[PDB]
Amino acid sequence: SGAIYVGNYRVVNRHLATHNDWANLVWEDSSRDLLVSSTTAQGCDTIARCDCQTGVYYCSSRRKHYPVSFSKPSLIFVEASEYYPARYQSHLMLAVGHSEPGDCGGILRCQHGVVGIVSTGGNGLVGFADVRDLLWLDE
């Protein structure tokens, strides 16, 4: 689990979105595993606006943060999960690292702010859904 709170927006993994997220929907993209809902309370997280390929992510299955090198956002084939088929996921970044299903939502940060959230795993790789291209999140 996990979310990003910026301005009057909440960014979550689309497969973990709640009824309240869907009832206050702003934007969702099934190919990216992202959903953004509106909030009444103001958030104060900052989204990174950069091309960093190094950062640190939170791994809830180890109660630890890990420094990683990750690939630029791209269209990657990902295997089937418990309730969803195998497909190409877009705007995905991969790194060598540990990730279990419940780790989804853990934030990847660089010196400029939030880069993305854990979205995929398997074969000793962790994949993060990028949010740096969503410039509207800060306006």
Ligand SMILES: Cc1ccccc1NC(=O)c1ccc(C)c(C(N)=O)c1
């Ligand atoms: C994070 C992880 C680690 C190890 C093994 C599997 C996972 N993946 C998931 O739990 C997961 C579940 C549901 C969906 C829709 C997606 C996705 N991004 O398409 C990923």
Ligand SMILES: [Zn+2]
């Ligand atoms: Zn950066």
